[PDB]
Amino acid sequence: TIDWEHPMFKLYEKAKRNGKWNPADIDFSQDQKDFASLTSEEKISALPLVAGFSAGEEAVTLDILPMAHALARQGRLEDVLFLTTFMHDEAKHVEMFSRWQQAVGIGQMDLSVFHNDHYKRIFYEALPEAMNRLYADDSPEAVIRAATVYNMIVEGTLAESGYYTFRQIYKKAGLFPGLLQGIDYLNMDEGRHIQFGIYTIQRIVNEDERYYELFIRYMDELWPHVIGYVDYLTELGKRQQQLARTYALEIDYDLLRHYVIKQFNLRKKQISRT
Amino acid sequence: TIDWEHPMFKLYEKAKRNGKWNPADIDFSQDQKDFASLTSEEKISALPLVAGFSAGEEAVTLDILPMAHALARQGRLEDVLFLTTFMHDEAKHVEMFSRWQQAVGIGQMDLSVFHNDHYKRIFYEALPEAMNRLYADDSPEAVIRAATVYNMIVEGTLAESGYYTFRQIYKKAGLFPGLLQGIDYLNMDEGRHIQFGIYTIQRIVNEDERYYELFIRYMDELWPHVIGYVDYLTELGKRQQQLARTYALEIDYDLLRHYVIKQFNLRKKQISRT
Numbered sequence A, B: 001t002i003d004w005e006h007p008m009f010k011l012y013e014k015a016k017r018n019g020k021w022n023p024a025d026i027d028f029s030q031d032q033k034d035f036a037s038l039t040s041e042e043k044i045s046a047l048p049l050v051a052g053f054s055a056g057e058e059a060v061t062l063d064i065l066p067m068a069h070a071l072a073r074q075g076r077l078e079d080v081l082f083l084t085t086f087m088h089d090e091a092k093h094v095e096m097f098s099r100w101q102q103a104v105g106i107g108q109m110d111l112s113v114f115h116n117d118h119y120k121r122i123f124y125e126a127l128p129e130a131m132n133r134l135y136a137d138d139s140p141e142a143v144i145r146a147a148t149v150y151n152m153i154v155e156g157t158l159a160e161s162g163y164y165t166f167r168q169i170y171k172k173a174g175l176f177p178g179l180l181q182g183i184d185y186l187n188m189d190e191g192r193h194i195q196f197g198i199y200t201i202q203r204i205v206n207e208d209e210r211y212y213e214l215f216i217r218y219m220d221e222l223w224p225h226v227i228g229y230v231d232y233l234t235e236l237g238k239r240q241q242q243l244a245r246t247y248a249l250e251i252d253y254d255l256l257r258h259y260v261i262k263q264f265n266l267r268k269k270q271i272s273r274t
Ligand SMILES: CCCCCCCCCCCCCCCC(=O)O
Pocket: A049, A052, A053, A056, A057, A060, A090, A093, A154, A155, A158, A159, A161, A162, A165, A190, A193, A230, A233, A234, A253, A256, A257, A260
């Protein structure tokens, strides 16, 4: 039947209760004015972080499907019910960033230019490969790896840090209130996504504590590309300093960096070896 | 980007606006009392139609995924955004029937007994085979067949007729107000599902009017099992006449039957050869 007490059924219920926001309701009119008011140099200072996210959301909307397939095939009905909310969330995320991009005029703008090699390695290689694998290989190893790259690294490390960074910068400056409303909603959805990942990894580790070592290993395997992208954005911003100056933000890249590091280690700690 | 004018983006927007209902909010307390008040013979008279639906909703929640995969792989982003709402709708449908079944006490009850051979041929063979095919064969032929069996026959013919039948019987009788609230919501969701099917078949026919003949052919191929199930339910009810008598319903199986026939032909007519 439905196991009403199943953790993923409970997460499904919360998703319905907490998932009513609609990107079509966000007022982006002030964002349009803010963006127009920026200098050409101030404009470029913002784009790298938006590039990472818009492309990232698109990647994950296509790439969660194989997990829903694999779990369906295993008969995990409550997981599948929850995953329908996960996939619809990601749809709204793609929608929200595309609306912002249109409202402020950079819809055309090929933002690919802000994706370095480490980024592409995560979003264009490790992520799609690990998810697609599940179509032919739904072994515990395969499922742990998919949840690690997608939920623990892409969402749980990069996206979390991305949200924090957005707040740290533009919330201070009083800029882009529509986008920040969007990001708050995104960040609320993402908490459920991460919880799914934790639950999935933990139940597999609960069967064989040796999958714990596999989890840690896959996390450390990805870390170089995580930090390598983070260094490239850090670096990139330190050149284009004009938005920080104009808006009186000592943009502390060294504390962001450690927020990333903090997120990575925190995700490890949410998986228990025993 | 997102093509804001795309028909499936517009259907996605409507789904969000019109898709807020939550099965967890439905009051089933009166349904519990109604069901308990029924005689043992009256109880059995209702179950066949509920059997068809609960199993049917479960089938379609698992079975829409390959279509979302195939269209994603073709780069039809707006279709995929809409399909996230379609899949979440089906989740709530499975949820709604399981809640009703629990509330009135038939959760255990193996309702498989009311699935005859024609039913199994649709839901356990033709439907999963046609959807799963899309994982390895996303040809126009394959996509038309998937949309025909799923959207035009299962939803557009059987489910539509099932809703009508539910209303005709229990709405008259003043019974099962919770279930009927649920069914109204379901039926509103299903209109978008059918519209997706029409759009999908029509855009493929628009490229080669010879796919029109393929559409009609696949519809007629399934008709025998549609009517054969409908005859078995018709037949089945005519024996167990006690609920009709008790509640003063001349249950007109001959008009239902023609409602089914009417639905089938109506679906053909929504696809234009030209
Ligand atoms: C000092 C800079 C550190 C900040 C790191 C920036 C992270 C931006 C990358 C965006 C990835 C978004 C993917 C989210 C996927 C989802 O929504 O499930």
